[PDB]
Design a protein around this nucleic acid. Structure first.
Ligand SMILES: Cc1cn([C@H]2C[C@H](O)[C@@H](COP(=O)(O)OP(=O)(O)OP(=O)(O)O)O2)c(=O)[nH]c1=O
Ligand SMILES: [Mg+2]
Ligand SMILES: [Mg+2]
Length: 373
DNA sequence: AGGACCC
DNA sequence: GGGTCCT
């Protein structure tokens, strides 16, 4: 269990795709999915006209006045389609890890190997790639790692075809030897295309990034830290002192991100299975007076109860989350958590009242059920 | 409870 | 507007 073949599947303009399927009249029209003041995503017709992902509505309608907007605040249908995609992938190989609602990783290593043991010592020379080869790299048919990655590209093309034929969804895929690289390479040709990464082009792909924030795993805060240190390019990170990095970011953060800067990433694809929590949210800027609003909490609850039910298992914890107004105090939500009584597991009024007291203990209200069993 | 990451 | 795992 050394060399892996991993695929990262990444759907095209996911919420917009779901809305275009629901209302066929939105096809070939420029479309944005709105949540509050944000155009959270848009179809590719809208991107040709200047609309970017996560652009506020104002900027977006003055870049593109004719933009059709649909409301995407209720995630129900996106969430449903997202699990349909994961399940279809699980049918290929069971170990599928979700990332957000529209990305999945699958470890294809076992599948690839079983396909190779099936071919004769003749048709191995007929193995061909499906889709793009990153950096137009030459294939060496006597290189076993090349052969396995190409069989990985064929599986990926089968997955994308099944998604289209069974669920009507288009998506990109990237095939590589670990999750970092599969995820980086999946986005090289978009929309609705796939690319495979041969090992010799791994430095080319990593150095194609323009800042270390682009590395999945290095977030807003770590990037701000690395900068403070004079680290800006992937190369700066690759060459920087391991010791200074260690005694500055913790040993954990430091040795992992430095590895990532080389293209190295041993993390396993983890079976996501059923979700670990179920929540719903409501935003309203200045609107929570601090008493009048629990009617909101009752609404969040009623939706949640139907979902948490549906699932089969039951939650043993409830949590209440709030955010508060004033100045740009850039992070700071607050939560109170307590167990759910065992009487009340086996519905509304007692839940509403647990919530209200938790409220009393303490722009945004949400409820989250977790600790499912 | 809260932090940091992800989409 | 969701979601994960770690401290
Ligand atoms: C980053 C992000 C994504 N999303 C949602 C909208 C997207 O349709 C879905 C997947 O995110 P992404 O894959 O980044 O975006 P996308 O699928 O819409 O577009 P692309 O073709 O470039 O892949 O997640 C949010 O709601 N909020 C966020 O902050
Ligand atoms: Mg994505
Ligand atoms: Mg996507």
């Amino acid at each position: 269990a050394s060399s892996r073949v991993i695929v990262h599947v990444d759907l095209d303009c996911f919420y917009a795709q779901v809305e275009m399927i629901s209302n066929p009249e939105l096809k070939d029209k420029p479309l944005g999915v709105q949540q509050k003041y944000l155009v959270v995503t848009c179809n590719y017709e809208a991107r040709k006209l200047g609309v970017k992902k996560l652009m506020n509505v104002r900027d977006a309608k003055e870049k593109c006045p004719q933009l059709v907007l649909v409301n995407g605040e209720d995630l129900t249908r996106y969430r449903e389609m997202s699990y349909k995609v994961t399940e279809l992938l699980e049918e290929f190989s069971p170990v599928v890890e979700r990332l957000g609602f529209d990305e999945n990783f699958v470890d294809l290593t076992e599948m690839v190997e079983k396909r190779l043991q099936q071919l004769q010592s003749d048709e191995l020379s007929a193995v061909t790639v499906s889709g793009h080869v990153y950096n137009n790299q030459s294939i060496n048919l006597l290189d076993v790692l090349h052969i396995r990655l190409l069989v990985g590209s064929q599986i990926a093309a089968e997955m994308r075809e099944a998604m289209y034929n069974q669920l009507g969804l288009t998506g990109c895929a990237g095939v590589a030897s670990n999750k970092l690289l599969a995820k980086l390479v999946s986005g090289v040709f978009k929309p609705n295309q796939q690319t495979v990464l041969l090992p010799e082009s791994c430095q080319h792909l990593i150095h194609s990034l323009n800042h270390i924030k682009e590395i999945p795993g290095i977030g807003y805060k770590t990037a701000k830290c690395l900068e403070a240190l004079g680290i800006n390019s992937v190369r700066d990170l690759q060459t920087f002192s391991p010791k200074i990095l260690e005694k500055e970011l913790g040993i954990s953060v430091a040795q992992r991100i430095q590895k990532l800067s080389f293209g190295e990433d041993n993390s396993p694809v983890i079976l996501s299975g059923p979700p670990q929590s179920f929540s719903e949210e409501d935003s309203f800027k200045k609107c929570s007076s601090e008493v009048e609003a629990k009617n909101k909490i009752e609404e969040l609850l009623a939706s949640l109860l139907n979902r948490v039910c549906q699932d089969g298992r039951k939650p043993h914890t409830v949590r209440l989350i709030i955010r508060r107004y004033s100045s740009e105090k850039h992070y700071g939500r607050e939560s109170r958590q307590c167990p759910i009584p065992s009487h009340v597991i086996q519905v509304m009024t007692p839940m509403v009242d647990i919530l209200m007291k938790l409220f009393r203990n303490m722009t945004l209200l949400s409820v989250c059920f977790c600790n499912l069993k």
